[PDB]
Amino acid sequence: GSSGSSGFQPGDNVEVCEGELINLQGKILSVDGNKITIMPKHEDLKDMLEFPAQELRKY
C-alpha cells in the first residue's frame, strides 16, 4: 500500500485566510498538491469544494 506523500494531510480543521471564501472554516478531505479539496461546514452548502493551500490556513 502507501503511507502519505510529503505535505499536508486531510482530516484536520482549517479555515480560509484570504479570498472570497474568507472566514470559512471546515474539515479537510484530501490534499491535491497545490490544490486542497475540503468540505465547508455550512447547511446552505450541500457539496464539497477545493481551495488552494494559499487560501486555506491551519488554525
From Swiss-Prot:
Tissues where this protein is expressed:
Ubiquitously expressed.
Q: In what residue span(s) does the KOW domain sit?
A: 8-39
State its location(s).
Answer: Nucleus
Q: Show which residues constitute the signal peptide.
A: none
Q: Which domain of life is it from?
A: Eukaryota
- Post-translational modifications reported in the UniProt record: Methylated by PRMT1/HRMT1L2 and PRMT5/SKB1. Methylation negatively regulates interaction with P-TEFb and RNA polymerase II.
Q: Which family does it belong to?
A: Belongs to the SPT5 family.
Q: What does this protein do?
A: Component of the DRB sensitivity-inducing factor complex (DSIF complex), which regulates mRNA processing and transcription elongation by RNA polymerase II. DSIF positively regulates mRNA capping by stimulating the mRNA guanylyltransferase activity of RNGTT/CAP1A. DSIF also acts cooperatively with the negative elongation factor complex (NELF complex) to enhance transcriptional pausing at sites proximal to the promoter. Transcriptional pausing may facilitate the assembly of an elongation competent RNA polymerase II complex.
Subunit note: Interacts with SUPT4H1 to form DSIF. DSIF interacts with the positive transcription elongation factor b complex (P-TEFb complex), which is composed of CDK9 and cyclin-T (CCNT1 or CCNT2). DSIF interacts with RNA polymerase II (Pol II); forms DNA and RNA clamps that stabilize Pol II elongation complex while maintaining the nontemplate DNA strand in the transcription bubble and nascent RNA in the exit channel. This interaction is reduced by phosphorylation of the C-terminal domain (CTD) of POLR2A by P-TEFb.
Q: What is this protein called?
A: Transcription elongation factor SPT5
Source organism of the structure = Homo sapiens
